[PDB]
Structure formats: C-alpha cells, structure tokens
From a paper:
Quinol-dependent nitric oxide reductases (qNORs) are considered members of the respiratory heme-copper oxidase superfamily, are unique to bacteria, and are commonly found in pathogenic bacteria where they play a role in combating the host immune response. qNORs are also essential enzymes in the denitrification pathway, catalysing the reduction of nitric oxide to nitrous oxide. Located in the cytoplasmic membrane, NORs reduce the NO produced by nitrite reductase and catalyze N—N bond formation in the reaction 2NO + 2H+ + 2e- → N2O + H2O with the formation and release of nitrous oxide (N2O). In contrast, qNORs are single subunit enzymes (NorZ) which use membrane-bound quinol as an electron source. Whilst cNOR is predominantly found in denitrifying organisms, qNORs are also found in several pathogenic bacteria, where the enzyme detoxifies NO produced by the host’s immune response.
Here, we report a high resolution, 2.2 Å, structure of AxqNOR. The overall fold revealed 18 α-helices packed together into each monomer, with residues 113–122, 227–255, and 564–571, creating the dimer interface. In our structure, the Ca ion is ligated by seven oxygen atoms, OH Tyr78, O Gly76, OE2, and OE2 Glu407, single oxygens from propionates of heme b and heme b3 and a water molecule. In the map presented here, a weak density corresponding to a non-protein molecule is visible away from the transmembrane domain close to Asp724 and His305. We propose that the density in our map likely corresponds to an endogenous electron donor that was likely carried through from the E. coli in which the protein was expressed, since no such molecule or analog was added during sample preparation. Residues Glu309 and Arg720 are hydrogen bonded to the ubiquinol ligands His305 and Asp724, respectively, with a critical Arg720 also making a stacking interaction with heme b, positioning it favorably for electron transfer. Analysis of our cryoEM structure of AxqNOR and that of PacNOR(7) has highlighted an attractive alternative route for NO entry, which is also compatible with binding the cognate partner protein CuNiR during turnover (indicated by red arrows). The conformation of Glu490, the gatekeeper of channel entry from the catalytic site, is different from the previously reported structure. Here, it is hydrogen bonded to the bridging hydroxyl and W2, in contrast to being previously directed into the channel and hydrogen bonded with Glu5599.
Numbering used by the authors:
A (entry chain A), B (entry chain B): 1 to 750
Amino acid sequence: MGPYRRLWFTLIAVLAVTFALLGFYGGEVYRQAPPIPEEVASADGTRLFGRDDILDGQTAWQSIGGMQLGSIWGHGAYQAPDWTADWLHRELMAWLDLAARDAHGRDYGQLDAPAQAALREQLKAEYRANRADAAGGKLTLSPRRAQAVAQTEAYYDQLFSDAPALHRSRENYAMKENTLPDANRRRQMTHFFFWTAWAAATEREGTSVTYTNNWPHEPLIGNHPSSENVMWSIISVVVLLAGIGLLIWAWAFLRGKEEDEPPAPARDPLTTFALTPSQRALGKYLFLVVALFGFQVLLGGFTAHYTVEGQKFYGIDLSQWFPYSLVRTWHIQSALFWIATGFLAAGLFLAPLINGGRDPKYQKAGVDILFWALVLVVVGSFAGNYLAIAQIMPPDLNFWLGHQGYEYVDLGRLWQIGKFAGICFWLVLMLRGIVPALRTPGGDKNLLALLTASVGAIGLFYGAGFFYGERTHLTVMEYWRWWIVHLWVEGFFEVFATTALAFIFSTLGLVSRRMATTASLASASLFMLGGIPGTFHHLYFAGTTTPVMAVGASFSALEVVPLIVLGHEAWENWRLKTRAPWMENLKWPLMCFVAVAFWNMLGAGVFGFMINPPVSLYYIQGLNTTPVHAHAALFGVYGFLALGFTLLVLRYIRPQYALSPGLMKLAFWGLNLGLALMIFTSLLPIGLIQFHASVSEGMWYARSEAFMQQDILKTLRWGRTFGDVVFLLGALAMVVQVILGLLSGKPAAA
Amino acid sequence: MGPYRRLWFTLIAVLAVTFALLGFYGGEVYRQAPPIPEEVASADGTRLFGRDDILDGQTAWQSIGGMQLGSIWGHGAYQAPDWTADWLHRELMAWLDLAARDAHGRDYGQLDAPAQAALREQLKAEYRANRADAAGGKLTLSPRRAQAVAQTEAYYDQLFSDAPALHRSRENYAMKENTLPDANRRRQMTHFFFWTAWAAATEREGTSVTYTNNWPHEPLIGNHPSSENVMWSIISVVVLLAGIGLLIWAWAFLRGKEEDEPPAPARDPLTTFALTPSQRALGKYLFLVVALFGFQVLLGGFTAHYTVEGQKFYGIDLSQWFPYSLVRTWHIQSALFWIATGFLAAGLFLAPLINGGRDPKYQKAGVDILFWALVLVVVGSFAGNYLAIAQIMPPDLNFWLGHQGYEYVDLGRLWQIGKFAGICFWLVLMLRGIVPALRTPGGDKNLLALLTASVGAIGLFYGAGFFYGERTHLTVMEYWRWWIVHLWVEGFFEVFATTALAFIFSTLGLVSRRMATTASLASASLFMLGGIPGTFHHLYFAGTTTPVMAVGASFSALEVVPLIVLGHEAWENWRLKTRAPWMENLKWPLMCFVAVAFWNMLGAGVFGFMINPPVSLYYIQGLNTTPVHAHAALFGVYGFLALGFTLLVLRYIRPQYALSPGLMKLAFWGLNLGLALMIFTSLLPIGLIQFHASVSEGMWYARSEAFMQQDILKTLRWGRTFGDVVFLLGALAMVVQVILGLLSGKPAAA
Ligand code: HEM
Ligand code: HEM
Ligand code: HEM
Ligand code: HEM
Ligand SMILES: CCCCCCCCCCS[C@@H]1O[C@H](CO)[C@@H](O[C@H]2O[C@H](CO)[C@@H](O)[C@H](O)[C@H]2O)[C@H](O)[C@H]1O
Ligand SMILES: CCCCCCCCCCS[C@@H]1O[C@H](CO)[C@@H](O[C@H]2O[C@H](CO)[C@@H](O)[C@H](O)[C@H]2O)[C@H](O)[C@H]1O
Ligand SMILES: COC1=C(OC)C(=O)C(CC=C(C)C)=C(C)C1=O
Ligand SMILES: COC1=C(OC)C(=O)C(CC=C(C)C)=C(C)C1=O
Ligand SMILES: [Ca+2]
Ligand SMILES: [Ca+2]
Ligand SMILES: [Fe+3]
Ligand SMILES: [Fe+3]
C-alpha cells in the first residue's frame, strides 16, 4: 500500500457498507417477496390454480422470451404491454363490468361517474385487501374476481395464440402469431400474469402499499406512488444535488494544487514491448467485438422494424422465425457479449503487458480457448433463444438451453454457466499476467491491485446470476439479476475500464501512476458508493418494500454524482492527446473515452437520473425513457469504452495500421450523433408522451396498443430510423475500420 | 467593450430572451388570472357577494398581515393554514356533509367508502365545473355549495374573531385573538378566502386543470398535479442535470489554460485610497446592517416562539401587540432591509473608490440622507405594520401605510415608494461615483459597466412592485411581487454582489480584471439565464397556466446549474486569502463569501431545487421546506454577502481595527452551524413530515392544526431552539464584532 491507504480504506469501507446495504436489504427482498399463494381458489371454494401453476406460468412466459416480450412489473420489453399492468387493468375492468351489471345491469363504461366511483371504491376495497392466508397458503378470489380472472385468462389465451381476433394486437405488440402455442402453457402463463397483477394490486399486510409498491399506476385500485416513494424521490434529488455540490466543493478545496507531470515518453511505451503471442491472438476478439456490435446494431434495426411493423418485413412474416422477442433478445445479448468482449480483450491485451510484456505460459492457448468459449456461448445461447422463442425447445430445457426470459440474462442457464466459466477463465488469464506483477518485490502495486480487484469483480460477480433458477420468485430473480446487469456491468465493468485506462495512461507515461492509482481508487469509491446499493433502483416495484426503494433511490442519487462531473475527467483524459505526439495514434480511442464521459454524464447520469427517483420511475418504468437511458448509458458508456478499448488494442496489435480519419469521423460522429438522434428524436419524445399517458391514465394505458398505435407515436417510432441509420453508418464505419485494421496484419487469424 | 464582446452579447442575449419569457408569460399571467366573478350568486338566485366583496376581503386579509398570517395559494406564512386549502377542505367537507345528509341522512364520515366515493364524485363534478359566466360575469353556486360556503364563512368569522371555541386554533395558528375584529371585514375576508378556494377548485374552461393548476392537493376534488406539472417536473430535473453536466463539460473544455496572475500588490490597494467622507459615513450603515440583523434574528426567535406558543410569552399575551403576524412581517422585512443595506453600503463604499478614491460632490450628504431615508422607511413601515396588524390603521390606509399583506413587500405602499426613492437615490450616489469612472477616456471599463448595470438593476427593478395595488388580482400581484423578491433580490443583488466582489478583488490586484470582468459577465449570464424566467417558479399555482409552470420549472432548473458548481468559485475566492499577506485582514469577509458559495449551493441550489419542480412544489408549497430554503438561501447567501460586505467595508472604514478571531469564529460558525441546525434538525424534518402529510392527505392536512400540533412536530419545532440559539450566538458575535469595530477609532455608529 503506502500513499493510498486512505483511498483504499475508503474503497473497502464503501464496499463493506454498500454490500451490507445490498446483502441486508437482500434478506428483506427475499422475506417481503409477494407470496405465491400455494392455492388460488374462488370464494365458492373451487381451486383455480396454485403456486406450481403460477411458477409453470413463469416458465411458459420465460419460454416465449419473458422480459423480451413486454414487461412484468415494468421489467422487459416495451412494444408489448406490461403484462402485469395490462392484466390488472383488464381484470379490474372485467370486475367493474361484472360489478356494474350486478348492481346496474349496465357496463361500468355505461354508468355515471358517481356509480363508477362507488364501483371503483368496491373494486379498490376488494383488490387491495385480497391478501393470501398467513404463510401465503391460500388466495381466495371473490367469485367476481374469479370471473374477471377467467375472462382475463381468456383474453391472453387468445393474444398469445393465433386467434385472428387479436392479430392486430399481436402486430401492434410485435408478438409472433402463436407466441405460446401450447394451450396449457398459455393457461399456466395467465396464472403467472394473474399472480403478478395480484401482487401488483394486493396491499402488504398492515400497509396501504401493494407488494409492488403500488406499481403499476392503476388509478382504478388507487395504485399511486406511496407517500414514502414520494418522500425518497425528493430526498434522492437533494441527495443528488447535495452530492454534486459537496463533491465539487470537496474537489475544489481538497485537490492540493497537484504536482508530478513528467514529460511524456518519446516513444509510446506500449509500442516498446513486442506483441506477445496472446496479444496478437486478440485480433479475432477485436473482430468478434465489431462483428457482434454490427450484428447487434442490425438486431436493433430488426427490433425497431417490429415496433413499426410487428410481423411482416417486405410481406414475409419474419416473426415466425425472428420475432421481436428473439431479435430483441439477441439485440440485448449481443450488446453484452461484444461489450464484455471489448473489456475481456482490453484486459487480455494488458495481462502480458503487466507481467513485463511477456505471456504467462499458455496465455495464447487460453486467449484462443476463451475466444471459442465465448463464440460457443454466443452461438449456443443465440440458438437456444431461437429455439426457445420458436417453442421447439422442450419447456423443461428452456431455462438451461433456451431463454431464461430475464432481460440481460436471457441466455439459457447452461450458456450463462458457459459465459461464467469463460469470464472465470479470463479471470485466470488476467491473473496469469497480473499475479507475477503483484508478487514481484517491487514499487507501487496499488493500481495493479485495484485492477486485479476489478478483474476478480468481473471474474466472479456474474455468478450472482446463479442465485435464481427457473422457478425462483420474480422478486428474488430480480434481486440477483440486477447484481449482474447493474452491479457487474454498470459497476465492476466501469471500475475495470477506469482502472485499465488509469493503468494504460500511467504505463504510457501520460499520468504519474500516483495520479492514476489515486484517480482510480477515488473513482472506484465514487462509483461503488452509489453504484452498489443503486442496484435497488431496479427493484423498487419488483415485489420489494419501501426500504429497498429508499436505499435504491438515495444511493442511485449518489451514483449520478460522479457521472455529472465527468466533464472534468473527460477533459483530463482528452488532455493526454497533447502530452506526446504519438498520442495521435490513440486519438480515436481517446475520443471514445471522452464519448464515454459524455454519455456517462448524459446517458447514465442525466437519463439514468431522469428515471431514477421512485416517483418518476413509478410512472416511467417500462416506458421509452428506459431504452433512452439504456441506449445512451449502455452504448454511450460501455459501448464506446469497448470500442475505445477495441481501437486501443487495434492500435497496438496492428501497430503500423493508421485509422482512416474520415472513416473514424463517420464511425465516431455517426455513433455519437446516431445515439443522440435515436434518443432525442424518437425514444425520449415517446417516453415523455407515454410518461404523460402513464401519469394521466395509468401504466396499462401508456403501454396499451390503442395508445402506442397513435399517429404521433407511429411517426416518432418511424423517425427513429434517422438516428438508427446515422448510427448504423457510424457502427458500420467503426466495424469496417476495425476489420480493415485487422486485415492489415495476417488476415487468417481473425 | 473589447475582449468581452461575446460575454456581453451573451448577457444581453440572456437578458433579451429571459425578459421576453418573463414579459410574454406576464401577458399570459394577466390573461389567464382566475376571474373574480362580478357576482357570486346561489343557483336559487340570491346574490352572495361579488368582485368588490372578494377584493374588499383581499384588503381585510392584507390588513391582518396577509401572507404573514398563513398562506393563500401556498404563499405566505406556515403556522396558520393555507387559507385556500383550509377553506377548500372545509367547504368541500361541508358540501359532503350536506350531500351525505340529503342522500343518506348520515354525515360523509358516517358513510361507507362507496357512498363516500360517489359523494366525492358528485363534489368533484360540481366544484371542478363551477366556472363563472363568460367575461367572469357571474359565479352561480349550487345551493349546497352556497350553504357549504355559508358554514365555511361562519368558521372563519369565528377563527379570525375572539370566539373562544376557536381559541386553541388561534393559539395553534399563532393568530392573535380578534385577528380581524370588524365582523364586516371578516365576512369580506371569507369572500376573498372563498374566491381563492374557488379558483383553486374550478377547472379552467376547456382544461382538466384548476386556475391554480390543481393547487392545492385536495384529493376530494381530484386536485392532483396536472400531467403537465409532472412532465415539466421530470424535464426540470433533466434540464438541471444536463445543465450541470454540460456546464462542467463546457468549463472543462472551454477554459483555455488561463494566464495573467500578477503578484498581488504589497499593500492592500483599497488602504492606499484615503477614506472619503462618504465612506466614513458608512459606519452607521454597518451599524444599521448589524442592528437590523440582530433585530431580525430576535424577531425570528419571537416568530419561532409563536410557532410553539401562539399567544403568551411568560403568560403575558404578547400577540395583542406583537403577534406572529407582526413579528413574522418584521422578521422578513428586517431581513430585506439589513441585507439591502449591506449591499447599498458595499456599493456606496465602492462608488467613491471607483472615481479614484474621491467623493462626488455631496456624496457624504447623500450617504447620510439615504441612511435616514432607509431608517425612516424601516421605522415607518414597521410602525405601519404594527398599526395594520393591531387593526388601528384605517382599512383604506392599510395598503399605503400599513401592511400590503404580501410577503417581502409587506411594507405599506408609501414606505415601498420610500424604499424605492431610497434605492433610486442610492442609484444616483453610486452613478455619482461610477459615471466619472465610465466617462474617463481610459482602459477596461467592462466590469464597471457590468457594475453600473447591476447598480441600475438594483436601482430600478424594485419599481416592478408598483404594478400591483391593493385590489390588484392576487395572480397579478404575484407576478409583480416575484419580480421584487426573486428577480431583484435573488437575481440583481447576486449579480451586483458578484460584480462588486469581482471589482473589489480586481481592484485589490487579487484577480487580473480580465479574469474579473470575464468571471462576472459569465456569472451574470449564468444567473440571469435561469434566474429571470425562474421568477415563474413562484407563480406555478398562483392562478397561472402550465406554460408559466414550464418556463418556471425549466429555467429554475437552469438557475440551480451555476449554484451547484459554486464549490469551484468558492475555492477561487478563498484562494485570494493566500495571494497577499494583507488578505488576512479580509479573512472573515472572504469566509463569508465562501459561506455564500456554500449556501448558494446548498440553500439556494439544493434546497431551492428540492422545492422547485412543479410536482414537488405542488405538494410542498407552503410547507416547512420553503422556510428551509428561504433561510438557507436568503441568510446563507445574501445574509453572508451582506455581512461579508459589512466586514469588508468595516475592514476599510476602521482600517486599524483587527477582528477578534474568537468572536468571528463564533459569529461565522454560529451563523453557518446555527443555520444548518435550524434547517436540518427542525425545519427540514418538519417540511418532510408535512410533505408526507401533504402527499398522503392533502395540503389542508399538512397545514392543519391537528397535524401541526402532533408531538413529533411540537418536538421538532421546539428543537429549532438549538440552531436558533447557536445562530443567535453567531449573529450576536457578528453584531458585537461589527459594533466594536465601529466603536473603535472615533466611534461613529448612528
Ligand atoms: C441502430 C441502433 C439501434 C437500434 C435501432 C436499437 C433499437 C432497439 C430497440 C427497438 C429496442 C427495444 C425497445 C423495446 O423493448 O421495444 C432496443 C433495446 C435495447 N437496445 Fe438497442 N438499438 C440500437 C443500438 C443499440 C446498441 C448499440 C446497444 C448497446 C450496445 C443497444 C442496447 C439495447 C438495450 C440494452 C436494449 C434493452 C433496453 C431496455 O430494456 O431498456 N442498442 N434497442
Ligand atoms: C453507464 C452506467 C449505466 C448503464 C450501462 C446503465 C444501463 C441500464 C440499462 C441497460 C437499463 C435498462 C435495464 C432494463 O431494461 O430493465 C437501465 C435501467 C435503469 N437505469 Fe441504468 N445504467 C447506468 C447508469 C444508471 C444511473 C447512473 C442511474 C440512476 C442514477 C440508472 C438508473 C436506471 C434506472 C432507474 C433504470 C430502470 C429503468 C426501468 O426500470 O425501466 N442507471 N440501466
Ligand atoms: C434565529 C434565527 C432565526 C429564526 C429562529 C427564524 C425563524 C423564522 C420563523 C419562525 C419563520 C416563520 C415560519 C412561518 O411562516 O411560520 C421565519 C421565516 C423567515 N425567515 Fe427567519 N428566522 C431566523 C433567522 C433568519 C434570518 C437570519 C433570515 C434572513 C436574514 C431569515 C429570513 C426569514 C424569511 C425570509 C422568512 C420567510 C420564509 C418563508 O416564507 O419561506 N430568518 N423565520
Ligand atoms: C440565493 C438565491 C435565492 C434566494 C435568496 C431565494 C429566496 C427564497 C425565499 C426567501 C423564498 C420564500 C419565498 C416565499 O416565502 O414565498 C423562496 C422560495 C422559493 N425558492 Fe428560492 N431563493 C433562491 C434561489 C432559488 C433557487 C436556486 C430555486 C430553484 C431552482 C429557488 C426556488 C424557490 C421556490 C420554488 C420557492 C417557492 C417555495 C414556496 O413557494 O413555498 N430559489 N426563495
Ligand atoms: C422532480 C422529479 C420529477 C419526476 C418525478 C415526478 C413523478 C410525477 C408524480 C405524479 S402525480 C400523478 O398525477 C396524476 C395525474 O396527472 C394524478 O392521478 C390522478 O389524476 C387523474 C387525472 O388525469 C385522475 O383521473 C386519476 O384518478 C388519477 O390518476 C396524481 O397526481 C398522480 O397519480
Ligand atoms: C422528485 C420529487 C417528487 C415530488 C412529487 C411527488 C409525487 C406525488 C405523487 C403521489 S400520488 C398521490 O399519492 C397519494 C398517497 O401518497 C394518493 O392518495 C390516495 O391513495 C392512497 C392509497 O393508495 C391514500 O393516500 C388515499 O386513500 C388516497 O387519497 C393520491 O391520490 C395520489 O395521486
Ligand atoms: C423503422 O423501423 C426500422 C426498420 O424497419 C421498418 C428498418 O429496417 C431500419 C433500417 C436500418 C437498420 C439499422 C437496419 C430501421 C432504422 C428501423 O428502425
Ligand atoms: C425557548 O422556546 C422557544 C421559543 O419561545 C417559545 C423561541 O423563542 C424559539 C426561538 C429560539 C430562541 C432564540 C429562544 C423556539 C424555537 C422555542 O422553542
Ligand atoms: Ca427492459
Ligand atoms: Ca412565505
Ligand atoms: Fe442500474
Ligand atoms: Fe425564486
């Protein structure tokens, strides 16, 4: 250790305290998870279904793409409805039509507002009070509810079949015809849908708050944000602004003038080390990064196609094979794979450069095995998803081989274990290069310690996804899944990137190593403080209680703090272009890392915070504001990191290859301005129109085909094409650029 | 001009565009102001009251302290209810009791939720649809409403009298017994109360939105934030975070390295110029600053006393003479006077130092006349308010001599003209010192131009308060009043301060003058951009339409941007302590200006933004979050500025007088930590408990005696005493310190 004990003990302290909050409120997530009533029975006494049928329905839902086909509890895809909200609304409306007929022999819609208000009050009384027995033993539905449920089951049985009545709906929902062709599976699935709506609509014992924290916004049962949601929402903003103001104050006042900026080396240091065999073995990883990235981008276009034409594509019904659910899955899964691969490549490039520019024994071996391991996992998983969504996949294999139905962990459990083994194997290849450099009785090993930590965090924190299986409770799946998607990606990828950059720039002699170790420990602490408990900003409405929402709100506020100030970091890293004339070769990677800062600030920070205070998210969860954020944050940050890192590794593994300034201006500006156009001209306007709808009418309405198929939204969804094309141009330029680079040095190992 | 053309044209552009938005949406504020129906009649045809009675009631309300005694449309004092919300709730509940009796011969409270829901639906139908005729000609009340109104009039007739039934309420409301002793005036006043509740509860023609933008939160008539409110609220946060992120990005990338830091002079430059006669004439202004400040602080304690014991003070009923309404008025009015005087003194100290350390002819004259002019205005206004609140003041003199009843412009119109004439006269004394320095055919006159602009902005933008008279529509009063309180204080005082500091530090040779002119033009643009349209964040619910709320929300978001980054500015100004050994003499003033930055960030920025997005404010307007902000922002920023400036002028006009490091550590830390304790241990917890109540039940409930008199709130109101005392200690230390200073070397503290 040495001059960074404080920054270390602060990181450890942040980790300790944060994983306390995450792990403790993890016990409260498990405990307060909406019961799955062993038995759902009508009051008349007839057994409707039970746990096993709700869970069987979870698996059927999984098998069809789960969260890749609309949403549950506001998690998943956005073209189909939130099934919970849609179900809730359809069941409550069915109930109200039965209520209204019983009491007035007119339908609810036919009644005067006062009759309607009284019905709504009886609906609310019934639905909100409809807890299962103690031990979540038996849920009795009133016969009206049992009936509402029966006729809501009927509706979804038709929607998820080939039933021509609901063809327009499937088109509008980018559902393939016969999404879920087994009638039993569809029935079971409706049980699952029921259960989520039920949870959504049932107050927790001795609360005014549903198991989903009154999610979704369903005025009919007085699902409105809790007052606590509203509390923590205001607190989050204060936490955020306090946090920024104090961070800037701390930084302004606790820098200490800063010193030690030696002249940059004469020669790029990283060009002094000869490419190890395992470093030249990364061309194919760079290929895979751009291949998957280009694939991914096309899959977004394919996905985006279905949001404007749910089924045909020049009159061939592509949805039979490549439905929205599949291409959305692939779109997301491919994003992860190519981003991960960028990072994995970045790391593997560094590993042998960390043990003094020499390969650990069998590092080229491992770098080639790891590569095919990843391609296997990608092809297998993708095939698995195809087969899951095609409904070829035996239901009882679906979760292993098919589609977990959980967004970002969609790949079958087998492939997920493959991916984990891959990433663990990469942990070994990294540590093969980093352990010697740690065990060498030498100088400042603190950046490298932070890196090996980062590397082990990547290495192992993807195994958080094995704490849920197929029939695990959504709330528990949700808990663990957001370890992966939020903690492992948005946290441990960040720190590994930031640490690997700090390490590269320090190694390049652009930054002292003190300045790097210090910068990257302080960053670690900054990101992890908000990051780690910020996992909960995904679990507000996932069957979780208000504490989870408090932690999530407040700590997600803290997570924005370091993002919003990234203007300064960005400039610090961009400054490095001028430190040495050879930094012109790292121009583009450096432009990426500035785009990372930019999008971290805007995408992750601004658009993450837009949707983060429970009260905002309460309404906008599962609206187009998420994909705004998701695009801006995942691509803008980790995509540009991965590409930046791609271009960096390319700079070194094709050291004579000069990037085309034109191609890279197109690649870089196409991506940046494509991404801004997608967000600002399509996704964000839509998310806001939907936010309006969600707030005005309810979540069901914001997600509803009638609403989603209105002309403004059709035009805004069509207008996405501009940004999508500007972006595909950029992505194409980037893909070509890297391909040309790779083809400029042995075209037959890529 | 010269190297600052861009920064100038940007300031002019910001001013142009901003005063466009303010002046344009000012036409929309006038046009969309809730009608005052010429006639209010029962449907049965009986004339209840009219315009003249509502306006007469406005004057009666004014006469009793207006906004210094609870709130109208969430503007005013917080110990009494919001009368609009309280009235609305009492009338709607009365209506519901009449409804419930008509239909069920039980009271609303006695009915089942469904009956209650149906009644609420009929209430909502009636109240929301209850527009006046076209031309705001006649408002017909349903006889039930006419009755609800009659029995709500009765309640307030009793509350505002000596009626022993409502004694506990008056105590809880810090209302004096016989607050409004004329029965007619009270009746008229209830008409006014009615009208505000009516506006609050009536949808605008062809909207779902009341004249007050559904304010207050009154679930009974589906007064909930508009979807637009909710829209602009999310946009504001995005505008804010985008704004910070981009500002930091712009700053990070568009600084240009920065150069020209000459060695600080050897001798304090300002000690080289001999004190002009008009500068020594400022001791008494410094006295008045601390006298009013100490008075003000005691008045806060007196005010705070009434929030825990509405009437007695060791068993003598002080409320007969010095009721909460009076001492709150004085508390606020004194704040303005001593803060203004700080600035006016600061300016007058600079005036002769700007025309080369020599007094314009008759500057000592003017500085003495201006002083007694201010003391006259302070004593007269204060006497006026006493007499208004005592109800001695003839009602028809009340608005001229008494109490305008509008917060921060409470002083009678005469005194307000006095204050304006004073500030205009100060404009002349400033320009007496600044015009020569501008007309001298010389070098860089751009800071001094920005200063003379700032000075003219102070000089004239207080005359915005003469665009409303006594019987002016609240919405129009509100429009103009917030020019004064928000624009003139929170905008033109800021820029004058910042410019006068830039000017002082530049004159001291601590900053280039380029760096000053540049810093202070960029600041001007930054503050004015958000500041000026941010006036509207006061008018969201004041009878204004959604555009006003959009502008207000978005531009108030922009106004936070420069505040949150002030950590950096603060450090830049604090840096100056080290530039010259003689800056030890300006240590404390510099500590003030850092406290200004701190509180600008936290008080104005964090706590201003806490309460700023229409959706937050919708619920928290008139809750203890405002006084948190108001204390932290007005004292923390302008109070410390004024005191900073006080200590600075003291440093020079008592140039041999050394400040007591102990006294000033107590003064400074007592104020800072007193202010933090007041906010964090009392006001903020309360505001949040009330926010909870406001969101859960409605504004009426959050402001209601039952709620406000709960034990937690009693304890939190009592616990204020800690911070109040720590603060009074600080203030006392500061007052003594300045007194001792003034009493040193020829004692001149008039
Ligand atoms: C032309 C480029 C792109 C297009 C047209 C596109 C389109 C889409 C579409 C249509 C969706 C689904 C919205 C829905 O659920 O109905 C989506 C989701 C997503 N896209 Fe993209 N995409 C593009 C690029 C990218 C890139 C480059 C990344 C990351 C590398 C990415 C990551 C994602 C993610 C993570 C989701 C899931 C978002 C969420 O659930 O909020 N996309 N995209
Ligand atoms: C680079 C950093 C980040 C990345 C890569 C990232 C990525 C994502 C992605 C892909 C999603 C969509 C997840 C889903 O479909 O269910 C998401 C959702 C979300 N993110 Fe981020 N994020 C980042 C930072 C942040 C920050 C800083 C915040 C808030 C402070 C935040 C808050 C959220 C919230 C609240 C959601 C949920 C939206 C919803 O449930 O519909 N994220 N994030
Ligand atoms: C010991 C010090 C202080 C105490 C105990 C105190 C107390 C109070 C109280 C009790 C209120 C009225 C809350 C209500 O409406 O019921 C109030 C309002 C106010 N105080 Fe103070 N005060 C203090 C210091 C100051 C100082 C130093 C300033 C400015 C120089 C100031 C400015 C104000 C303002 C502007 C209001 C009106 C606030 C609003 O309506 O939101 N106070 N104060
Ligand atoms: C130093 C700068 C500022 C000062 C001196 C200041 C002062 C005040 C004062 C004294 C109040 C209470 C007014 C009243 O009683 O009706 C107030 C209210 C308010 N301020 Fe500020 N303020 C400042 C900056 C800001 C900022 C930066 C924001 C938001 C971006 C803001 C937003 C508000 C809002 C929304 C209210 C209304 C609260 C309510 O109506 O109950 N202010 N300000
Ligand atoms: C500052 C951060 C900004 C983001 C966080 C703000 C989140 C917004 C809070 C939403 S309040 C929401 O508004 C709703 C309507 O606008 C209101 O709900 C009601 O209103 C309907 C009128 O259309 C009414 O018919 C329904 O009974 C009901 O849905 C209510 O304000 C709440 O749901
Ligand atoms: C960033 C800061 C955000 C500030 C804006 C705050 C957001 C306001 C949205 C709250 S919606 C509002 O909440 C109220 C309760 O919290 C709701 O109350 C209602 O339903 C509740 C039972 O479900 C209960 O309180 C009452 O029975 C009933 O009046 C209210 O209708 C709802 O719109
Ligand atoms: C409007 O929906 C869309 C398509 O189908 C109609 C596309 O094919 C395309 C074409 C471009 C790509 C990225 C495949 C885009 C952009 C798209 O979003
Ligand atoms: C001592 O008791 C109290 C008062 O009178 C009842 C106050 O004046 C005040 C104000 C504080 C001072 C300086 C006594 C508060 C808050 C209080 O609790
Ligand atoms: Ca999703
Ligand atoms: Ca007030
Ligand atoms: Fe997240
Ligand atoms: Fe304001």
